[PDB]
Structure formats: C-alpha cells, structure tokens
Symmetry: D2
C-alpha cells in the first residue's frame, strides 16, 4: 500500500479532556477516503456526559490525512504515513474563552485503520455565552493558510473560524496550529490553503450523548493566475 493508506479506511478515536473543571472521555469510530479528503466520524461521550458545554467546540480535534491534495503541492501528512503525525492547537474565542488540543495520528496498516488519540482542555467560557447556553449549530466553511517552517520541518496553520448560532449570529475563534510529522520529511511543501467543510448531526438518545461529524477538505494554491 502507498504509505499504508487505502481509499476506504476505518478510524478509532479516543479523546480525554476537561473544560472549566468538567472532565470527560469520548470514544468513537469512523470511515473515510483520505484521497478524496472525506471522513465520517461517530462519537459517543463515555465519561462526563451529558456535556455542559456545546459539543461543537470539540469538532476540529477529530486528521489532515483526510485532505485531498493536488500533485503540485507536497502532501506532508500522507508522506508521514504510516507512522503518522502529531499536532497542537490553540482555540481563542472572541469572548475570552481559550481551548488547547493536541492529537496523535497513527496508521495501523494491517487493520486498514487510523488510530487517533487526543486531549482537549478549555477555560473561561462565560456562563451566559453561546457555548454554555448551547446556542451553536455548526462551524462555517473555512480557508486555512498552511505555512512551512523549513528549519524545523514542521507546518503552521492559521484559520479564523466562526461557529454559527441558533439566533442567526456568529462566534469567532482563531485557530493557531503546529503540525509535526513523526518521520523526518524528505520534502517540504510550499505555503498553501486548505478549505474545509465540517458538519455535526446530533444522534443522542435517552441513554447516550452521541453525534456524527462529516468533514471534507481540499488543498489548493491561489485562485489568481
């Protein structure tokens, strides 16, 4: 297999976190096509549910392997497979709340499964804010800028994000991320953009808090000639 990836893989997730003192554990699975940058993620709160904060704050913690890259842009993430990569991000919300998340991605070639482990921590969500009042519905499609740090062979991501609200409003978050291959890269990409679409569908029931996330991402260069 090239880098051990196939166009129909499974995923396994485990996230441990704490927001304003509330601890939780989430587990899930999923399926996706890394070559088309599309994935389906099924999550369930196994500890700490029901969450007192909007689950949308956690969505972007659940894998750049799921990015459709054109041949003209180096694909740092798939080149890091099957060992995988790690990433660290800060979430700065406009009302002062701050979150930080980190994850480790590994490909289990024999199982055709991607193992994802993450940690998510957040503080100072206001009691009257949209996250504690569960006023959010989904993140708006975005355009992230990816920049190479050639001296360390790592990438930096910059994306101004917006969580859409039930009353028609919007809530801004600045995502600053560092992406690090586990394998020393033999090539580094030039800067580029990654456009993303991420959607959440609640699937909770009387017994468990659960939902599905669907992400589609594609890398590109400037649209201007």
């Amino acid at each position: 297999s090239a880098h051990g990836l196939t166009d129909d893989m499974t995923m396994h997730f485990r996230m441990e976190g704490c927001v304003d003192g509330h601890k939780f554990v989430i587990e899930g699975n999923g399926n996706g096509n890394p070559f088309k940058g599309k994935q389906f993620i099924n999550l369930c709160v196994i500890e700490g549910g029901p969450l007192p904060f909007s689950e949308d704050i956690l969505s972007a913690a659940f894998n750049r392997l799921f990015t459709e890259y054109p041949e003209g842009i180096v694909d740092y993430f798939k080149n890091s497979c099957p060992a995988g990569y790690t990433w660290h991000r800060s979430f700065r919300f406009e009302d002062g709340a701050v979150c930080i998340c980190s994850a480790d991605i590994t490909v289990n070639v024999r199982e055709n499964c991607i193992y994802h482990e993450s940690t998510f921590y957040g503080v100072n969500f206001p009691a009257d804010g949209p996250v504690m009042k569960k006023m959010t519905t989904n993140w708006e499609p975005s355009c992230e800028k990816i920049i190479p740090i050639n001296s360390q062979k790592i990438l930096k991501g910059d994306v101004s994000m917006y969580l859409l609200l039930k009353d028609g409003g919007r809530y801004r978050c600045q995502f600053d991320t560092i992406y690090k291959a586990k394998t020393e890269p033999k090539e580094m990409p030039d800067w580029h953009f990654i456009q993303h679409k991420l959607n959440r569908e609640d699937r909770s029931d009387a017994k468990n808090q659960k939902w599905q996330l669907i992400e589609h991402a594609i890398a590109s260069r400037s649209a201007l000639p």
Copy 2:
C-alpha cells in the same frame, strides 16, 4: 452604463498619512477592469519622501469595485455605484505595530474615472523591525472572509495577511475591515470569500519615490460541495 462602470476605467488617488510622526502625501493614477477584478496603480510620494518605512504597509489601502463577482453572490460594491462606498480598517502587526486606514471611493461617470481618497496612520514600528529596515518585498496571496452585518447593511472583512521578507521570512498582519455603501443597499450578500493577489514593483528614480501596484481579486463561496 450599469452603475456607471465600464471594463476599462481610470482612477485618481490621493492619500494623506503619518507613521510614527512622519507625515506624507501620495498621489497617483491607474487603470483597471472592475468586471475582471484587475487594476494597475501608479503612485508617487509627493510630500514626505523618501519614506523611512517600507512602502508595502500601504498597499492594501489602494477598492473592492475591482473584484470579479460571480452572479450567485450579491456584489455589494458595484451595487453601491456610482455613489461609491467607504471603508475603515485596522492593521495589527505581530511585533506590535498598529496601523489604521480609511478610504472613500466615488465613481465619476462622465470621466469614466474612479476617485479614491484615503488616510493612513501607523504607530510603533520597531526600529529593528522589517518595516523600518525595509526588509519587505510583497504581500502573499490571501483569502479574505466577507461577512454581512444585516442589521446595519454593512460588511465585515477578516484576513490574516503576511508580508514576505528579503531573507525568506514572513511578517504577519491581521486586517479587520468594515465596508459601507454610500447608497442604502437593496440586497445584501451572504458570507463569501475574496481571494487576492497584490504585487509591488518599485519605479523610483533620483527625483521621486514611485511604484506600481497590481491587484487581482475574485469572490467565491466554499470550494467544497
């Protein structure tokens, strides 16, 4: 003429500004095709030259009429013509320097000329920073998010910008802008992106500090289906 615009117009510019106490006046002219979002700008420092700061900090102050919009996205700027529009922006650089700029755009239909008047103010550029050491070469292509403020019938722009440096480095700037039509809008667009390419070519000589700016901009929605 529709909104008084044609595909081969001229422009007239006048900017008055002050950066860290250094006053200056710039005048220029240009030509462009608003329907293809392309423009050529010729500037000359008529007061305060030679500028002690990199002229690249001023480039984005020189007109969303020059944006190619698809029929599926409301074109707030051309709809504001010929009266025009005004805009206000803050420039926050990573080393603490801050700039603010404002402009007024008007179309002179009989002259087939767009009149642009602007003001630019900046403070606290470090003496050892890339702007005072004139280490910049050009802004990197970007993707700006445009958001409607329906209750005020104005638009908000958000774009993380990067000035490229002569040693291969980059210098970040966050642009926050408010766009306001002079004519009450009869329609408002939905959110969208505006991709931009802006280039500078020095054309100074022993008598004057002068340069040419070339901008190309196109509006779009998410690339993901």
Copy 3:
C-alpha cells in the same frame, strides 16, 4: 524652575482627529503642578461637535510631565524639559475598534506654560456598542508598567484599561505606548509603575460640547519589600 517647569503652570491643547470618517478638532487649556503629577484640563469641541462617539475614548491623549516621580526612580519626562517629548499609542478595544494617537509636548519657559498638540484616529466602533451609544462614564484607576528600551533611549508603556459604562459594564482597552524625549537622555530609568486616576466632568451647554478632565499620576516601584 527646574528644566523650565514650575509647580503652577498652564497648558494649551489642540487635538485634530477622525473616528470612522467623522472629523473633529478640540481646543482647550489647563493648569497643574507637574511635581505633584496633578492637572486640570478644560476642553472644547470647536469642530465636528457634538461628537457621535463617546468623548471618553480621547481622554488619555491629553502628558507624562504630570507625574509625581520619587527621588529613586529616574524621571524621563521632566528631564527632557523644556524641549519636551513625543509619544505614540495604540489600543484595541475588546469589540474590535482600534484607535491610535500621538502627541507633542513642548515647554514654553517664557510664558511658564506647556503646548500640547495631538492627533487621534480610530476605526470600527460598532453602531450598537457603548462608544457610539455614548454610554460611558469614566476610565477606572490603573497601574501602567513603564519599561526602558535602553538601546534606543525610549520607553514602552503597557496598561490594561477599563472604561466604565453607565449600565454597569466595563469596556476593555489595551494601551501600548512608546515614549520619546526630544532631548537625548543621559540617564534612563529602570522599569517602574505609574498609577493613574483620570476623571471626566461634563460641562456641555447649548452652544458647545465641553468638559473638564482631572488627572493624578504617581510613579512607583513594587509594593512588596
């Protein structure tokens, strides 16, 4: 009169500015004792009045000469008298509005007075925010950190400010300032604090928008032994 200053002086003030396109000019006078860091400032809007934005945003633009300095901390400001000094400041309000201001202080020993000239520019105050709704009452007492920049013989100021609102809230501003002596410093101070008290008393009437500002400022080191 040390450095051309006395303990009973007068001041002349002139401010020219523009906020979101609204131009204005303020004229005023004042009296105070720089040795006790205490001053009385009488201002009047003679152009652009009545201001469409809260006049409290302009209050800290009206002179570190008025700072009680103890024997043990170097007084950077009085030391440059009577030539004076210049300063440049920026601050970003929590709702995204950004202002930049600069001033020029000159001591007129012949008339035992101070001439103060400043410019104030600001952008993107939300129509529904406290500044445009003119819902402010006063700045809360603060503690600014002053840090020396030895290789340039200039000073950096850092103070987190809070504008109290008629409705009980607090509106935050971050003040970042650079202070520069017009006469080259032979001595530089080490870091220190500058506590300030600034109050606004409205004195408007049918003819003019006008008010009085009262500032009391004292320099100090840490309160802990």
Copy 4:
C-alpha cells in the same frame, strides 16, 4: 484559626501537565502565613524530568489564600476557607504559545495545612524561543487587577506578565483568570489590585529537577487619593 487558617501553615502540592506532548508530574510542599500573603513552595519534578521547557512557565499555578488583604477590601479567598476555591487561567505568550491551568485548593483544618491540586497544559512553544531554550530567569513583579462578577459571585483577574530572560529581554504573557469560591460568597469585594512578587531559586541536582518558589502578594486600592 479564622476560616480554619493559621499564620504558620504547610501545603501539599501536586501538578500533572503536558506541554507540546511532553507529560510531567510535580510533587512539592510548602510553608507560609496567608495573613501576610507570603509563602515558600518546594517543588520537584518526579516524572517527565528534566523538563524540556522552562519551569518558569509553571510558577503562577502554585493560591490567593496567600494574599495580605487590608480591612477595607473584602477577602474573597479566605472567606471560602476552609472549603477552598478553584481557578481557571489562560495566557497567550507573545510568540503564540498558549497555556491553560486550573487548580483546586482545599484547607485541611485537622492538620493545619493546605492541599493544592493543579493541571497545566500548553502548546506551540517555538523550538528556538526562550522557553524551549530554557533561557528564563524570573517573572517581574506585577500588579493584577481583580474585578468582581456579581451576578455569578466569581472574580476575574487581569495581569500583564513579563518573564525576564537570561539574555536581557522580556517575554510577555497575558494572564486571564476566573476565581471561584467552593463555598457561596455572602459578600463580594469591589475591584482592587493585587501586587505580586514571585521568585524561583533552582535547587536541582544529579537526581532531580527541583526548585523553590517564594511569593509575596498584597491587595490594595488605588495609590491616588
């Protein structure tokens, strides 16, 4: 022993954290007089040592009980003793690194001691920055602003911090904290300042990374009459 506190107490500390994927655990003890806001904290890295990042980033995670409060300002922290209180904080370093920390303070009246439990997480410290190069020496004395949030009976802390570097520079951090009594407040304080002095004395050896922290903190109102 008012609120179960004495003027000669001991403390037990335990911190679990992770910075950019590096996990660690610190164990320690201490002594101090909460009435004089003075404490001695002895810490040891028992897991993850030696730390690859500067241990100074962790120092303010180790108790407002240790704050000299004058008669005229309400002491929110001692008032919740002996149950204790909890706090949540974030700060973004000037180079983009972001940390979040939380602690739990409990008074053990039976043994006249304090139990402190905390967690510290941080991300995106640049490999070439002062934290990863372990080039820091100490935090500079500060002045934190404490503001009440009456409808929630909690407090907000705002302090601009500066980590001094071995090479002479200063590395800035913005601390945003929310303070919460575990026992419901019957009285709330009005805004006030809290000046702090925090020093680190390295005590490492061939076996362990360890040090002593000494904090002195005093509450006050404005220095101006």
